[PDB]
């Protein structure tokens, strides 16, 4: 029911994909703290890696971390469907990827500057910093902060 949990091995800080993550949270919600990974995707990734769902991130072992990391970089290898992926159909090369911590923000930025260069109304709206998805702006977003 309970374990002393082997004092001297329970990690408290981790560095998975060059972002610091506190390990005392539940594994899935600890993984959620990396950009491009949410509760659903982290939950499925932890499920595929066979690591215990109710385990704490600071107590799982090292090769568990590496298997989890490998699973969540080439998802289609591990039977993660074509859907459920972050960036599907990938309009640069047509291969459904999944963007991650630095890759997500970077690639979003390249898509943004493409939309700026393409001179699309959406792109110029993004460049101005106004609302894009076609909602009223007379009464909303009335301060920048």
């Amino acid at each position: 029911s309970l374990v002393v949990q082997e004092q001297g091995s329970f990690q408290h800080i981790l560095r998975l994909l060059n972002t610091n993550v506190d390990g005392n949270i539940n594994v899935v919600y600890a993984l959620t703290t990396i950009r491009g990974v949410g509760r659903r995707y982290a939950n499925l990734v932890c499920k595929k890696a066979d690591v215990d769902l109710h385990k704490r991130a600071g107590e799982l072992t090292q090769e568990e971390l590496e298997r989890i990391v490998q699973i969540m970089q080439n998802p289609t290898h591990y039977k993660i469907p074509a859907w459920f992926l972050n960036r599907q159909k990938d309009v640069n090369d047509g291969k459904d990827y999944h963007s991650l911590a630095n890759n997500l923000e970077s690639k979003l930025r390249d898509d943004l500057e493409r939309l700026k260069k393409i001179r699309s109304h959406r792109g110029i709206r993004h460049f101005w910093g106004l609302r894009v998805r076609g909602q009223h702006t007379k009464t909303t977003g009335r301060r920048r902060a």
Partner: protein
């Protein structure tokens, strides 16, 4: 890096049919072209191929004005200069290889930007 659209490269992009692009196209374009097409985009295709042919091979082809905003930019369109109706003005737009997938309306801003103060 050079331009590829969905693994179909720029070189393949210029010489390629509409239907294969539809297979490459997203869901909205897939439905639009699978729903049947009006005669007006076909006439636009014919006029634009004529305009591209007429240009003496070394300068920007003559601008073709058009009211059509609801049709999309197919791979046969790149290399073209079209004036999309804005409500007033057939706003100029040269069709880049990155035009494709979008409509024309995104490049004719129907509203002037608002400046306060």
């Amino acid at each position: 890096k050079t331009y590829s659209y969905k693994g179909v490269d720029l070189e393949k992009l210029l010489e390629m049919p509409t239907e294969d692009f539809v297979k490459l196209a997203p869901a909205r374009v897939r439905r639009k072209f699978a729903r049947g097409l009006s005669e007006k985009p076909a006439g636009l295709m014919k006029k634009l191929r004529a305009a591209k042919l007429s240009a003496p091979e070394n300068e920007k082809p003559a601008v073709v004005r058009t009211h059509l905003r609801n049709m999309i930019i197919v791979p046969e369109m790149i290399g073209s200069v079209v004036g999309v109706y804005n409500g007033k003005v057939f706003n100029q737009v040269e069709i880049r290889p990155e035009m494709v997938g979008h409509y024309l309306g995104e490049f004719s801003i129907t509203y002037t930007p608002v400046r306060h103060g």
